[PDB]
Amino acid sequence: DSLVLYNRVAVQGDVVRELKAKKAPKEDVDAAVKQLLSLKAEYKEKTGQEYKPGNPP
Numbered sequence: 001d002s003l004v005l006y007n008r009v010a011v012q013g014d015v016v017r018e019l020k021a022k023k024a025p026k027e028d029v030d031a032a033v034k035q036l037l038s039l040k041a042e043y044k045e046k047t048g049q050e051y052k053p054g055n056p057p
Contacts, residue, residue, distance in 0.1 A: 006056040009039035013051060 016032040040051045 003056065005039075005043060006052070009036060009043060009051045010056045012036035012039055013055075 012032065012035045016029060016036055019028045019032055022028075036051070043052075044050050
């Protein structure tokens with residue numbers, strides 16, 4: 001199901017935004033953003049769809 005992969009990248013995406021809102025150090029934002037990037041890369045493998053905006057349906 002493509003929806004399952006949708007939730008995985010969406011879950012990290014939000015964690016990065018939350019930490020930055022918490023004024024956390026660059027280490028928390030950089031590491032967390034790197035995590036979401038790995039999820040986005042897998043989505044790209046199918047047809048370059050990457051993290052679609054508007055969160056999961």
